[PDB]
Symmetry: C4
Subunit: 90 residues, 4 copies
């Protein structure tokens, strides 16, 4: 549980630095700075408007952006599910 929760903040800082870098100058509202990018990656993590709201407009500028966003989900939405199950078991 402890080793998993730490890995999640590490993955969330590496993606939040990257999302600010790649889609910063192009999408300043959602990917302006690290904090802006953290808040928006979390929105994508809870699945809220992930595709139609953020993931789709970004592809219209950066067509390959799905390589960033789809794997992040297949990871973060698995991790959190595994982490929460770990809490109940322990």
């Amino acid at each position: 549980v402890g080793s998993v929760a730490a890995l999640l903040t590490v993955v969330f800082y590496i993606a939040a630095v990257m999302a600010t870098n790649l889609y910063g100058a192009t999408f300043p509202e959602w990917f302006g700075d690290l904090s802006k990018s953290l808040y928006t990656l979390f929105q994508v993590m809870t699945l809220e408007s992930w595709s139609m709201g953020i993931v789709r407009p970004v592809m219209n500028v950066h067509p390959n952006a799905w390589v960033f966003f789809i794997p992040f989900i297949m990871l973060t939405t698995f991790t959190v599910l595994n982490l929460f199950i770990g809490i109940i078991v322990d």
Copy 2:
């Protein structure tokens, strides 16, 4: 299960009083009164339009509002998941 379900209504009254207070006069549609604030915090709890719909417009007036909304989710969306698992366990 009983001790958890009661804690959920307590957390939902403390946040519903707070959400009406902080974002009331500024966002009367979603945070006008306790009932309005209860219904909207629940929308945030089920994750439905949470960010793009409510959480984002509120930050454009109250930039720190994320300190209220992100923790509420990391709590209420964990509690309900743990509560529902508790029901199934206390049956088998």
Copy 3:
């Protein structure tokens, strides 16, 4: 599993008859007929746009409509979760 799956179709016919009746003439796009009402109650069941999309516009005409929609969710989104767990166990 069998006794639960049958209860779900029964609850989905009683609500689909009711939703067509209450919010029919007022909201014909989403609650016109039984089938229209079934499809829309399912959208509410998967939580997709449930509040901002359907539940909110309906309250602006029928203020108490939340008494119909919130309990339906606390039931159908629990039932399906319990049913799917039952399949994996059996």
Copy 4:
């Protein structure tokens, strides 16, 4: 776990070929090619905007499209849930 993960990519190729075929010429933005159709079926799989965003506009042209989209969900959103549970079990 291995036999389930392979079945998921097989179901996702059979639907992605079909979605491109049926709703291609009519909905080129979301169902233009196999890749476009894969990405959009996945959006439907995670439930994100599934109904109000994609499933509803498509029915206004193809009224029976719900026969394609509702079963896909009752399958893919069950499979992934069962697959993820299989991973946790094959670890403890």
